[PDB]
Design an enzyme around this catalytic site. Structure first.
Site, short mmCIF file in Angstrom:
data_model
loop_
_atom_site.label_atom_id
_atom_site.label_comp_id
_atom_site.label_asym_id
_atom_site.label_seq_id
_atom_site.Cartn_x
_atom_site.Cartn_y
_atom_site.Cartn_z
N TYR A 22 0.76 -1.24 0.00
CA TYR A 22 0.00 0.00 0.00
C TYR A 22 0.79 1.29 0.00
O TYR A 22 0.22 2.35 -0.25
CB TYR A 22 -1.00 -0.03 1.16
N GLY A 24 2.58 3.46 -1.91
CA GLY A 24 2.86 3.74 -3.31
C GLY A 24 1.53 4.15 -3.91
O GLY A 24 0.58 4.41 -3.16
N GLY A 26 -1.98 3.62 -5.31
CA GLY A 26 -2.93 2.53 -5.21
C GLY A 26 -2.50 1.52 -4.15
O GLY A 26 -1.92 1.88 -3.12
N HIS A 42 -4.01 5.19 5.34
CA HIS A 42 -3.93 6.50 4.71
C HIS A 42 -4.72 6.44 3.40
O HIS A 42 -5.51 7.32 3.09
CB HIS A 42 -2.47 6.87 4.42
N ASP A 43 -4.48 5.37 2.64
CA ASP A 43 -5.18 5.14 1.39
C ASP A 43 -6.68 5.20 1.67
O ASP A 43 -7.43 5.89 0.98
CB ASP A 43 -4.83 3.76 0.83
N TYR A 46 -8.04 8.70 2.47
CA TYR A 46 -8.21 9.53 1.28
C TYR A 46 -9.50 9.10 0.60
O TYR A 46 -10.27 9.93 0.11
CB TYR A 46 -7.01 9.35 0.34
N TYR A 67 -3.11 22.37 2.41
CA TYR A 67 -3.66 22.82 3.68
C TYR A 67 -2.55 23.57 4.42
O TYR A 67 -1.44 23.73 3.90
CB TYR A 67 -4.13 21.61 4.50
N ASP A 93 -3.00 12.91 6.69
CA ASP A 93 -1.56 13.01 6.54
C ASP A 93 -0.87 12.97 7.90
O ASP A 93 0.14 12.29 8.08
CB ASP A 93 -1.19 14.30 5.80
C1 LIG Z 1 8.60 7.14 6.35
C2 LIG Z 1 8.64 5.75 5.64
C3 LIG Z 1 10.08 5.17 6.03
C4 LIG Z 1 11.47 5.61 5.31
C5 LIG Z 1 12.73 4.91 5.56
O1 LIG Z 1 12.73 4.20 6.73
N1 LIG Z 1 13.76 4.95 4.78
C6 LIG Z 1 15.05 4.24 5.02
C7 LIG Z 1 15.84 4.68 6.19
O2 LIG Z 1 16.51 5.75 6.14
O3 LIG Z 1 15.82 3.96 7.23
C8 LIG Z 1 8.39 5.57 4.02
C9 LIG Z 1 8.42 4.03 3.46
C10 LIG Z 1 7.61 4.09 2.05
C11 LIG Z 1 7.22 5.65 2.00
C12 LIG Z 1 5.90 6.02 1.08
C13 LIG Z 1 6.16 5.56 -0.48
O4 LIG Z 1 7.47 6.06 -0.91
C14 LIG Z 1 4.93 5.94 -1.40
C15 LIG Z 1 4.57 7.53 -1.36
C16 LIG Z 1 5.74 8.49 -1.96
C17 LIG Z 1 5.34 10.04 -1.85
O5 LIG Z 1 6.43 10.84 -2.37
C18 LIG Z 1 5.06 10.47 -0.36
C19 LIG Z 1 3.85 9.57 0.22
C20 LIG Z 1 4.22 7.99 0.21
C21 LIG Z 1 2.83 7.35 0.76
C22 LIG Z 1 5.58 7.64 1.14
C23 LIG Z 1 5.34 8.07 2.75
C24 LIG Z 1 6.71 7.65 3.37
C25 LIG Z 1 7.05 6.03 3.46
C26 LIG Z 1 5.72 5.38 4.27
CA LIG Z 2 -6.28 24.20 -0.38
CA LIG Z 3 -1.27 3.57 -1.65
#
Ligand SMILES: C[C@H](CCC(=O)NCC(=O)O)[C@H]1CC[C@H]2[C@@H]3[C@H](O)C[C@@H]4C[C@H](O)CC[C@]4(C)[C@H]3CC[C@]12C
Ligand SMILES: [Ca+2]
Ligand SMILES: [Ca+2]
Ligand SMILES: [Ca+2]
Ligand SMILES: [Cl-]
Length: 118
Positions: A22, A24, A26, A42-43, A46, A67, A93
């Site tokens: 999830y 990414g 979709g 979160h998905d 939204y 926002y 968020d």
């Molecule tokens: C904050 C976490 C953890 C990052 C991490 O631990 N990186 C390695 C490290 O340095 O240890 C990351 C893992 C996958 C990320 C998500 C994915 O990359 C998909 C998507 C990308 C968008 O730019 C932001 C929302 C969104 C939904 C990201 C929110 C941040 C997530 C949930």
């Molecule tokens: Ca606005």
């Molecule tokens: Ca998603």
């Protein structure tokens, strides 16, 4: 908005690639871990924002909605002056950034083969 969400996340976790089923665009099947559950939720948040009969976002995407939010000591605060639709997105968020912070990152789930394990 999506760019704000990125900063909000960095605020909750001081100092991106797809993850799980999830995190990414979709998503499908079932979340693989806690962090992946944070994204599914979160998905779904939204998804609920779109269902709000009083809200209609550009290109029907909540990520376009900007926002107002502030960050102190990794503490996130959605501005009360945000309109209801913006407040709903900001809170989605916010909860996710906090959900992420208190969740474990399992390297074996980064760039998962969603076609097989999701
Ligand atoms: C904050 C976490 C953890 C990052 C991490 O631990 N990186 C390695 C490290 O340095 O240890 C990351 C893992 C996958 C990320 C998500 C994915 O990359 C998909 C998507 C990308 C968008 O730019 C932001 C929302 C969104 C939904 C990201 C929110 C941040 C997530 C949930
Ligand atoms: Ca606005
Ligand atoms: Ca998603
Ligand atoms: Ca509208
Ligand atoms: Cl609007």
């Amino acid at each position: 908005a999506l760019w704000q969400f990125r900063s909000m996340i960095k605020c909750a976790i001081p100092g991106f690639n797809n993850y799980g089923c999830y995190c990414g665009l979709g998503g499908s099947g079932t979340p693989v871990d806690e962090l992946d559950r944070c994204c599914e939720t979160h998905d779904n948040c939204y998804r609920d924002a779109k269902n709000l009969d009083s809200c209609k976002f550009l290109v029907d995407n909540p990520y376009t909605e900007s926002y107002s939010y502030s960050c102190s000591n990794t503490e996130i605060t959605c501005n009360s002056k945000n309109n209801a639709c913006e407040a709903f997105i900001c809170n989605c968020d916010r909860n996710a950034a906090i959900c992420f912070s208190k969740a474990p990152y399992n390297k074996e789930h980064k760039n998962l083969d969603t076609k097989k394990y999701c």
